[PDB]
Design a protein around this ligand. Structure first.
Ligand code: CDL
Ligand code: PC1
Ligand code: SF4
Ligand code: SF4
Ligand code: ZN
Lengths: 115, 179, 45, 115, 49, 96, 209, 95, 176
């Protein structure tokens, strides 16, 4: 927390003055959209694993300065940007649905370099 | 000069001395440029706040090197993925914080000075030893050994006509070329 | 014979300056305006 | 094996549909191209030539090959009207600098030992 | 005093280049009026300094 | 040495010689045909035949590192003075 | 290294990449046909042709991948494969300092929907893959020629295309314009057959076929 | 070098620095162009003791890529540990 | 490690802004450019008087090629045929024959100066160090044919620059 840092050092990415609760409401949202994808899905299990866990201390620890090393992912102002990206993925692979087997096995030995 | 397996030849005797003399005087020449351009209004107004890009677009556009570091992106190949002996040397990557034309210019001139740091360190810590690998199958044998030893002659013959056969596979290697 | 090849001096080469050595010279801003005004009233007088 | 992806066209009908307006466009462009590019050839020569390259490939059956070559043939008409090509780039299609190559069997036999 | 020596060196250039003729010769043939010690000579007339 | 052709046309060590017509010779007039007056064959033939009394003689060719790859030519054929392939120097041995 | 001649290997990265290789594999059992981690700590994700958007969007925005740096896109024309072309993406992660390689097989006619939406860097990096190789990219802003000459014919990087090509230019005084003619060389390419008849390294040998 | 002192003050004062300390061109400081012959070292594996190529086979020790999953409770991992925020410059952090 | 290059904190005291106003009004920084460039006006130039003096080179220099020969006089080249094999521009074209003596050398060593790259691979190619690049670089010409060299032309150049290159490889073969 502390004094609002003037710039993030990355032009284009600004400083959000209320970062902790924005990260909160994002993390619930991806948990919310993750409700649609059935339980057996591996992507759901992976991100239901790192969402609530990473939602843990952001709910508990309110100091964004300590939140830097809680997530070890750089500045919070782009962590929420990354959280948005994860939300975009949840929307995207809700169409992709890759849990079916391969569309096609690779035609004969198209792999197996060298020829 | 830079061949697979090291370098083709060794430096002429005393070459480290002359480049050391150049290194001492070169920092003055960098000061010469900064005096000439850095504080000049005309240069700044033709350069400052010009061609600015955000960090995300710069990274998504596939940019690299100064194009990212000028926009504040914290990345450099020599530091993040140190190839060759770049790990055993320290240097200050000149990260800007505007992304416009001016930030990259100051980023470059500092990279000039930080390059001069590398010359100084490698000069005081130049190790002895051979210039190429000790494997004739990929490194041509020494000329003296060429004209006295059969296996040198065969390996030299096959290396300069057929060449070393590289095992199959694929590899995209990456270095931070000043571009 | 012993291995002779291009090697640095045993103590190493001398330190190489790399800072920016831009010279802090010139007069104070007030002095610039003071003399700038100073030569003026001489001219009008 | 037979089943395949229609890069733009299901059937040769819509493939032949695609060639039509591009043929219409290529016939409309001839008077202006010769005008601004400053040539010496006649408008009809462009028309009967634009005729020419439409025919030597007018024998395919796969609707992918025709329509992929449609976007290929698409890819010069705009390259002309925006004066991107040079004069040498469209007199190249008017191959004129060469001697007329031999057609009868005797003429090839006379020139050299090469079918 | 320093400017006097430099002018003295300038006149020494004319004396070194065989008086006036050689000084004018090298200036209009080589654009150089600086004189150095003789170092060698091939079998061609190519004066080396 | 060097010889002279019927058209003058100083022959080379290889033996190239343009014929009477040989229209390609038109490039030669108003210019000069570069000929290396030193011919390899007859500047090694007159060289003295070395006399070394051994069966096997190294043939580095002077300055072993700077010469040619050292060979171990045999010296037993009394009919023919054994010579290095690279050097061309004819090493003969006195009366075995 | 006890043997300084040979290059030391990094096993720690090797299974860590292998762990991430299985990771992405389990998310998309529909797309990820093959995952391979080579000896030099390089991981390769073999995907289906229609996976250009999904897996790349996955690698770009994932929490555990964040591969947003499009290094390059290249084709590998292999005649002996029924899919001659092999489009190869290279991805780089700023956060995990790692590299990602994904390859898609493709024929001449079969198109690949453009990855411009995923990475806008690919905008220019398709205008030459269409030029050099001839693989067409669907729903792409522009496919213009930027390497081959204006109106040049063919796809030079194809291995059925000669190194000398077919057309050679020369300024012609008859027409006051440089014009193209069939190529005839001053000297032909003296090809060299350097493949030794004795077998190389036996590790990568093909099985008895 | 040639240059008289009064010129040197003019150059030094105009540029704001002393230049006779280091100059753009060269002088007697360079190494002479007839350096003594060198005695380049030998290879690390140049020994005529045990040196079998069966040990060093860099080209031959290469292995085709390891098969891990082929078409024919879980943890969450990353391809590498996330990067570490490097600290500012110790010599000069703010230029 | 890293450092910032544009973080400027202009102190807003009455002092510094006066300097900033002085900078803009009286072109102090521009005057530095004048005084800066004036400084080198009064300095000597480093303009070599070509061709009365050339640039500094090194014994390893690569220039116009010249086939050499042994102290006896016999040519070094032995139809080794390695030179064109390693030459990455295929400028070398060499064909050998039987010779009358049996030291069967070549009839042709045409290297196209408009094809070669002055790679340096030539001397590293033939073990008898037959073809080397002489230190000459002024072998310019006006017709493209003269740049096309031939076995006679190289061997003539070898006999010309023999005094130079022999000493060059004399002082450099230890490195090689
Ligand atoms: C403007 C100021 C007045 C004119 C220049 C005066 C000048 O150069 O004085 C010598 C002298 C040269 O100093 P420098 O440039 O440091 O000399 C560098 C080398 O020592 C130079 O060493 P160097 O061995 O090269 O010196 C030889 C040099 C010596 O040259 C001189 O001494 C210059 C004066 C002409 C002789 O003469 C030549 O090189 C011969 C060729 C002369 C070319 C044409 C000269 C035209 C002069 C003006 C003509 C009329 C206008 O001047 C000074 O030291 C300070 C400026 C002048 C002070 C004197 C009062 C005015
Ligand atoms: C023989 C010929 C001898 C004279 C040659 C020209 C002398 C003047 C030009 C060279 C100056 C070299 C740089 C220098 O001294 O900079 C000092 C300093 C360097 O300043 P600074 O850029 O470091 O900033 C410090 C001063 N403040 C903070 C207040 C801006 O510059 C000056 O003193 C400016 C002097 C020139 C003023 C020009 C405007 C007035 C012109 C009036 C009519 C004439
Ligand atoms: S010049 Fe050298 S490489 Fe070429 S044929 Fe002669 S010996 Fe062999
Ligand atoms: S001249 Fe250069 S390019 Fe030509 S063969 Fe020699 S090294 Fe190769
Ligand atoms: Zn010999």
């Amino acid at each position: 927390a502390g004094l609002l840092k003037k710039t993030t050092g990355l032009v284009g990415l600004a400083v959000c003055e209320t970062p902790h609760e924005r990260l909160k409401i994002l993390y619930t949202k991806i948990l919310d959209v993750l409700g649609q994808i059935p339980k057996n899905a591996a992507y759901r299990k992976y991100t239901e694993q790192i969402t609530n866990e990473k939602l843990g201390m952001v709910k508990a620890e309110p100091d964004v300065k300590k939140l830097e090393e809680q997530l070890q992912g750089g500045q919070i102002e782009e962590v929420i940007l990354q959280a948005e990206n994860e939300l975009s993925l949840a929307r995207k692979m809700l169409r992709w649905k890759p849990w079916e087997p391969l569309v096609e096995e690779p035609p004969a030995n198209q792999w197996k370099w060298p020829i | 000069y830079i061949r697979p397996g090291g370098v083709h030849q060794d430096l002429p005797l005393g070459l480290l001395d002359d480049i050391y003399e150049f290194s001492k005087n070169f920092s003055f020449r960098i000061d010469e440029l900064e005096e000439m351009l850095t504080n000049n209004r005309i240069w700044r107004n033709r350069t400052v706040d010009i061609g600015v890009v955000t960090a995300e677009d710069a990274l998504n556009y596939g940019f690299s090197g100064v194009m990212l570091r000028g926009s504040g992106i914290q990345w450099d190949l020599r530091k993040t993925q140190p190839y060759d002996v770049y790990d055993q040397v320290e240097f200050d990557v000149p990260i800007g914080s505007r992304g416009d034309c001016y930030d990259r210019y100051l980023c470059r001139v500092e990279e000039m000075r930080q390059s001069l740091r590398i010359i100084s360190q490698c000069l005081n810590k130049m190790p002895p030893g051979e210039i190429k690998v000790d494997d004739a199958k990929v490194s041509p044998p020494k000329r003296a050994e060429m004209k006295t030893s059969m296996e040198s002659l065969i390996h030299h013959f096959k290396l300069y006509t057929e060449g070393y056969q590289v095992p199959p596979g694929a590899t995209y290697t990456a270095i931070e070329a000043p571009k | 014979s012993k291995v002779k090849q291009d090697m640095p001096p045993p103590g190493g080469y001398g330190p190489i300056d790399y800072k920016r050595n831009l010279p802090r010279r010139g007069l104070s801003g007030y002095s610039m305006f003071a003399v700038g005004i100073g030569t003026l009233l001489f001219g009008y007088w | 094996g037979t089943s395949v992806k229609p890069i733009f066209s299901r059937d040769m009908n819509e493939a032949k549909r695609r060639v039509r307006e591009l043929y219409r466009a290529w016939y409309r462009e001839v008077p202006n191209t010769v005008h601004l590019f400053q040539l010496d050839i006649s408008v009809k020569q462009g028309r009967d030539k634009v005729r020419e390259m439409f025919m030597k490939n007018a024998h395919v059956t796969d609707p992918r090959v025709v329509d992929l070559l449609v976007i290929k043939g698409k890819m010069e008409l705009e390259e002309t009207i925006n004066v991107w090509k040079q004069r040498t780039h469209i007199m190249r299609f008017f191959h004129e600098t060469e001697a007329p190559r031999p057609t009868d069997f005797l003429s090839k036999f006379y020139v050299g030992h090469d079918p | 005093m320093e400017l006097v020596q430099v002018l003295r060196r300038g006149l020494q250039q004319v004396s070194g280049h065989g008086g006036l003729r050689g000084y004018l010769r090298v200036l209009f043939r080589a654009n150089d009026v600086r004189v150095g010690t003789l170092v060698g000579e091939d079998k061609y007339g190519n004066k080396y300094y | 040495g060097v010889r002279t052709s019927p058209t003058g046309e100083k022959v080379t060590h290889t033996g190239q010689a343009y014929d009477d017509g040989d229209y390609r010779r038109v490039r030669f007039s108003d210019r000069q045909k570069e000929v290396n007056e030193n011919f390899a064959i007859d500047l090694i033939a007159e060289q003295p035949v070395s006399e070394v009394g051994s069966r096997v003689i190294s043939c580095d060719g002077g300055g072993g590192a700077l010469g040619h790859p050292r060979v171990y030519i045999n010296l037993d054929k009394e009919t023919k003075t054994g010579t290095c392939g690279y050097c061309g120097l004819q090493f003969r041995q006195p009366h075995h | 290294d006890t043997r300084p001649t040979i290059r030391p290997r990094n096993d720690v990265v090797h299974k860590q990449l292998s762990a991430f290789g299985q990771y992405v594999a389990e998310i998309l059992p529909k797309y990820v046909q093959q995952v391979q981690v080579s000896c030099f700590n390089e991981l390769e994700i073999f995907i289906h042709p229609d996976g250009v958007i999904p897996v790349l969007t996955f690698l770009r925005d994932h929490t555990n991948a964040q591969f947003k740096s499009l290094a390059d896109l290249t084709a590998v024309d292999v005649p002996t494969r029924q899919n001659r072309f092999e489009i190869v993406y290279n991805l780089l992660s700023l956060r995990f300092n790692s590299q990602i390689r994904v390859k898609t097989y493709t024929d001449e006619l079969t198109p690949i929907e453009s990855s411009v939406t995923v990475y806008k860097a690919a905008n220019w990096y398709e205008r030459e893959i269409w030029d050099m190789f001839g693989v067409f990219f669907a729903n792409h802003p522009d496919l213009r020629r930027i390497l081959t000459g204006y109106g040049f014919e063919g796809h030079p990087f194809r291995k059925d295309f000669p190194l000398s090509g077919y057309v050679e230019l020369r300024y012609d005084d008859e027409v006051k314009r440089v014009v193209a003619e069939p190529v005839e060389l001053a000297q032909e390419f003296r090809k060299f057959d350097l493949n030794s008849p004795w077998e190389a390294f036996p590790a990568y040998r093909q099985p008895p076929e | 070098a040639s240059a008289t002192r009064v010129i040197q003050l003019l150059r030094n004062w105009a540029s704001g620095r002393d230049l006779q300390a280091k100059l753009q061109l060269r002088y007697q400081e360079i190494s002479k162009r007839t350096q003594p012959p060198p005695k380049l070292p030998v290879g690390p594996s140049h020994k005529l003791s045990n040196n079998y190529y069966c040990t060093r086979d860099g080209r031959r020790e290469a292995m085709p890529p390891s098969i891990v999953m082929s078409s024919q409770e879980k943890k969450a991992v990353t391809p590498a540990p996330p990067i570490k925020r490097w600290e500012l410059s110790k010599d000069q952090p703010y230029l | 490690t890293y450092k910032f290059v544009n973080m400027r904190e202009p102190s807003m005291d009455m002092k510094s802004v006066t300097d900033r106003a002085a900078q803009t009004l009286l072109w102090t920084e521009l005057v530095r450019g004048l005084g800066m460039t004036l400084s080198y006006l009064f300095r000597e130039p480093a303009t070599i008087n070509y061709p009365f003096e050339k640039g500094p080179l090194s014994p390893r220099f690569r220039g116009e090629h010249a086939l050499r020969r042994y102290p006896s006089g016999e040519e070094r080249c032995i139809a080794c045929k390695l030179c064109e094999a390693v030459c990455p521009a295929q400028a070398i074209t060499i064909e050998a024959e039987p010779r009358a003596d049996g030291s069967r050398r070549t009839t042709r060593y045409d290297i196209d100066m408009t094809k070669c790259i002055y790679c340096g691979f030539c001397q590293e190619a033939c073990p008898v160090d037959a073809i080397v690049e002489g230190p000459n670089f002024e072998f310019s010409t006006e017709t493209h044919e003269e740049l096309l060299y031939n076995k006679e032309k190289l061997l003539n150049n070898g006999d010309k620059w023999e005094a130079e290159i022999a000493a060059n490889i004399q002082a450099d073969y230890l490195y090689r």
